[PDB]
């Protein structure tokens, strides 16, 4: 009520979208609010790629507050690549606006089949300045530097399909969203919202592991070796050459992920990382986990984690707040 609140909706009960506009005239767009990137892009009227056929497009000519740039840009993600150029206009998030530098995408061929298979228009990064391309100060930071918000921090309360809507709260924390106390973990770097925690699954542990809280990732990312040791005696079936892991949803051997610090302990049991795949077979589930190796052993805590845990992203205090999310609002 006192801070900016953007309503969130789930997408195929895994990911979630939020809306925001560009230009002095509204011009709405559906975004993937990605704490794992630091750039903002939107499909341009100038787009020529097939993937833009179903999307809302941005038209600078119809915006008085438009400021041209033109410097070609290539935004790279783990899942794909999108091309275009830089531009600047009024970005309206929730109910606050600000002149912001963003990317006008015109080529989305490197982001298929994801882009055409999804209903979002663009991506709105919520990471750190250094993660951006073209030295762009985060939206929440800029907003704070302009006395538009009390604190430079945003909150995420993911939505549950047929249960409740979600919220991206900017500026302040609201107890309506979480239960119990909040616990903060300091960032180990000002790039992604990356913190350090011990990763313990079974008798397998990886201490001082790099954990990235990323709303832009649909799954739980685990280092390859860690995953393999993890699925050893379990009764999971990895379809040959595919990151497709199937099990009986009631499989009594399924472990609980346990991330710890001297401040708190965060767990993620089966019900949070399993996806029903009943259409495939009765009583069947898939792990929604992915083996992914980075320079430094990293765990990506995506939507599955954020779905169980209300999260606070503090730019001013360079830390992440974690608390148990409310079952219902």
């Amino acid at each position: 009520s006192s801070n900016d609140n953007i309503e969130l909706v789930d997408f195929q009960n895994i990911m979630f979208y939020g809306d925001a506009e560009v230009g002095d005239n509204q011009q709405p767009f559906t975004f993937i609010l990605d704490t794992g990137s630091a750039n903002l892009w939107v499909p341009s009227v100038k787009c020529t790629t097939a993937g833009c056929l179903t999307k809302h497009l941005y038209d600078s000519s119809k915006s008085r507050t438009y400021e041209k740039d033109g410097t070609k840009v290539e935004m790279n993600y783990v899942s794909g690549t999108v091309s275009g150029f830089f531009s600047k206009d009024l970005v309206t998030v929730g109910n606050l606006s600000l002149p912001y530098k963003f990317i006008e995408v015109i080529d989305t061929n490197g982001f298929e089949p994801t882009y055409t298979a999804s209903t979002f228009d663009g991506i709105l990064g919520l990471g750190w300045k250094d993660l951006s391309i073209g030295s762009v100060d985060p939206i929440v930071v800029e907003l704070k530097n302009q006395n538009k918000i009390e604190n430079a921090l945003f909150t995420f309360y993911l939505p549950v399909h047929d249960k409740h809507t979600g919220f991206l709260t900017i500026g302040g924390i609201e107890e309506r969203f979480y239960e119990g106390p909040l616990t903060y973990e300091k960032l180990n770097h000002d790039l992604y919202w990356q913190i350090t925690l011990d990763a313990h699954v079974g008798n397998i542990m990886l201490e001082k592991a790099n954990c990235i809280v990323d709303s832009g990732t649909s799954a739980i990312t685990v280092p390859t070796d860690f995953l393999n040791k993890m699925l050893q005696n379990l009764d999971v079936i990895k379809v040959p050459f595919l990151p497709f892991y199937v099990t009986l949803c009631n499989n009594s051997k399924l472990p609980t992920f346990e991330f710890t610090s001297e401040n708190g302990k965060y767990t993620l049991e089966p019900e949070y990382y399993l996806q029903h795949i009943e259409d495939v077979g009765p009583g069947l589930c898939m792990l929604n986990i992915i083996g992914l190796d980075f320079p430094v052993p990293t765990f990506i805590l995506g939507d599955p984690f954020m779905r169980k845990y209300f999260t606070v992203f503090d730019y001013d205090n360079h830390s992440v707040g974690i608390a148990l999310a409310k079952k219902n609002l």
Partner: peptide, 6 residues
């Protein structure tokens, strides 16, 4: 799946 920057 989707894994969001380089």
């Amino acid at each position: 799946x989707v894994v969001x920057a380089x």
